[PDB]
Amino acid sequence: LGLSITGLGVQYPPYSLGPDAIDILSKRYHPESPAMKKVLAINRYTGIDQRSSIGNPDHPLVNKPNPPTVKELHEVFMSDGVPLAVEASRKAMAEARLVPAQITHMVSTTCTDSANPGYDHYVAKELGLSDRLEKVLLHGIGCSGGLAALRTAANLCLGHTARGKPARILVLALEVSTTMVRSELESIDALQETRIGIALFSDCASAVILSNGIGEAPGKPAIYDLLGWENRVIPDSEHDLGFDVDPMGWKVVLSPRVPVLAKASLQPTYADLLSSLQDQLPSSYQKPADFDWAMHPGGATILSGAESAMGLTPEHMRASYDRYINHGNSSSATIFSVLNRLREKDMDALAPGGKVKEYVVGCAFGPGINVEMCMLKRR
Amino acid sequence: LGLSITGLGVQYPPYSLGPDAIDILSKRYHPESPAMKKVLAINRYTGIDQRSSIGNPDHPLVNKPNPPTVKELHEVFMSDGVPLAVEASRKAMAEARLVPAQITHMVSTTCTDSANPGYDHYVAKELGLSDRLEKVLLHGIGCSGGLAALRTAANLCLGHTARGKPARILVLALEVSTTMVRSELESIDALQETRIGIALFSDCASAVILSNGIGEAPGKPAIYDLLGWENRVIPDSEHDLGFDVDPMGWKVVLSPRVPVLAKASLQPTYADLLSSLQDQLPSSYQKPADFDWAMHPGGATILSGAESAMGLTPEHMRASYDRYINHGNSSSATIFSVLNRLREKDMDALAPGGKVKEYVVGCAFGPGINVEMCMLKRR
């Protein structure tokens, strides 16, 4: 295929918040109620130690009499979110040793903004990218966005390959979820339903460069080679997982069924992934535990579910646990943060069998329910 | 390249709104004011006779004490817009002689909805498309979306060509703008600014099937072959055109510069398009007047601007005027409606000098400002 990730960059925002950040804001704006009690309790059962945020509980946006409107949310997405995407993209470009003029496409995603021009326009502008740049801003897909953007970039790379053209694609995910805290609080208080969104999600931008190899001076270094991918939708599961537009932003839909449906989808999707490319793999990469696993940490039960279904230890998904515990679920931006972390020396120390694996399965689930899986070779 | 459009389908909603529709609603919900007076005057000089709509001025969505919220807008996008998209897609597939299992990708666009799962998920499910379908839902681009989606589908088709696989891509645009009438009325009244969007925009869904030829019969019919494409961003023009998310939907941004910038972009974009394919065109197809022009009718001065810049008659853009006069500006869905109409016998009889052209230039502009242009060969 000639497809390789030649750079990765991750930018988390300045603030790191413990579980009491939610308690502070809840107390400030709502009297205690049964549903709030339940959710405040759940906020402490996730296994997330700290979450990344563009701000703290005293930020003016979330301290109005009302939750901020979707317009007010957009304003902060641009002032505090966009800067993170530019820095993540610069880092990925620096690692890949590419200059702005060499970027041929950009595939971006977010589920926590709506805008025309889209946020990718402003990022490309700050990076000084070409006025001829081909851009894709994906919408509709939430947490599976990082891998869906990577898969989309792969297809686009191969389109240029078919024409004998160099392709260097900036693949970007930016999520700013923590600003919707007051919206979720209002829904919990007024509707008295146990909405677990406030407990899970955080802010982040992450980027990789995907190259089709054409035009590279030979023997050029890469971090991962992209070998293959699979994608599926789980039937009759639209009502289980979603993010509905609202004058207050977007409202989380997240049912108890989600981690059950996700776990059941793992084994047959992995089978299809592996069968499409097994003849490219060595004898030491045959069963799920032989690989390192870059799982999107959608929640604690996704990780324990995956360990259970595939027969893995936590250390097989060490970088996933690392991001989840220390940063929380940053939706589409999390997966590239995981792949970035996985190749660092202190994750190497924790490799199952004392063997850092040459092959990595990536996996993510999102609204649909959409399942995304990919196979990487780590150089 | 082996790329062709093998089917097209267009579905307008049943209702047609004359210039009185805006008068009815404004009088019902707002006092007389200078800004309202100006907009009501301008409305009658747009060059539009009728605008296609999912409803009439007595629709309950637009007759509440306040404008509908973006949540209420989504509900109607889903109930009234999605069925148009399913039917436009069905018709494109029918002309292409394809069954649901043959569709390998879907590339969709809208700027008048935000949802997760996006509207494309629900359209694909209604059509019975594959659980393995690769989907792209574009955001951030508004009116240029039809051609951006076509261009994106072109790169994706070629991705499959690189692997020797068949690609048949459903390319879909759906816009429902008429529902934001109370939002724009409120802005005109409140801000006392002459906002002309209310007078221009309408509702439509349109779709094409783009094929990469692999596994097609030798010399398989098509309606158009896709020969090439160009895309550019006009620098320093983000403020000139846009669609900002808001509790009441999205608010139109439009400066006086737009017609001049659009007009001025034609010559260099066209020159680049043609330079990239000079020895694929006959010498009888060199200057703009040599081609038929499928121009996105953004407004009357866009069509007249193009005539002036490029030395064309109104009949060079006959299908563009036909859509504009009779249906209004349906944003991203308009271009495929124009391309569908252009090939009808009725438009043939109005060709410049009675010469129906073998090559068609498609052109659209949207927020960015993004310019898109493509070269089609008509069969």
Ligand SMILES: CCCCCCCCCCCCCCCCCCCC(=O)O
């Ligand atoms: C800026 C001030 C910081 C305030 C305290 C920080 C705590 C914030 C709680 C997080 C709110 C979560 C809102 C849910 C976002 C959902 C993301 C997409 C999920 C999906 O794809 O369905």
